């Protein structure tokens, strides 16, 4: 996999951000995770975490996997990085997202994220408290 440039337009919720990619606005849905909806417990916290991470970065980058690049809703499916740090991983590490939607063919960073989730669950963080 390789990182590609994108510029942040808006953080939307815990697991979706709008960003300019190859010069067009795209809503990206983070691969391999599921944050609560904003209306659910830890939703506002997941939203705030992704908003702070993305907005504070000097650069954002997106990294597509080997399989589907867009979902049925037209959303880009990617791993997003904020100054080299993966947002998908950070959310899971903080107990603000569960590893989810792991589809064969589009699961390159599955084990990285499952390692993170085990550690969040150990520390009983947020969703795991
Ligand atoms: C993360 C991810 C979500 N999706 C789809 C499956 C779910 O469809 P259904 O909407 O029919 O439930 C939906 C979940 O997104 P949200 O968690 O943003 O709702 O997005 C994918 O198709 N591929 C993916 O890699
Ligand atoms: Ca969600």
Short mmCIF file of C-alpha atoms and ligand atoms in Angstrom, two decimals, residues 13 15 29 34-37, ligand 2:
data_model
loop_
_atom_site.label_atom_id
_atom_site.label_comp_id
_atom_site.label_asym_id
_atom_site.label_seq_id
_atom_site.Cartn_x
_atom_site.Cartn_y
_atom_site.Cartn_z
CA UNK A 13 -17.81 12.06 12.59
CA UNK A 15 -15.04 7.49 11.16
CA UNK A 29 -14.99 6.21 5.47
CA UNK A 34 -16.68 1.44 13.45
CA UNK A 35 -17.09 4.43 15.70
CA UNK A 36 -20.44 4.93 17.46
CA UNK A 37 -22.91 7.23 15.66
CA1 LIG B 2 -20.16 4.31 12.34
#
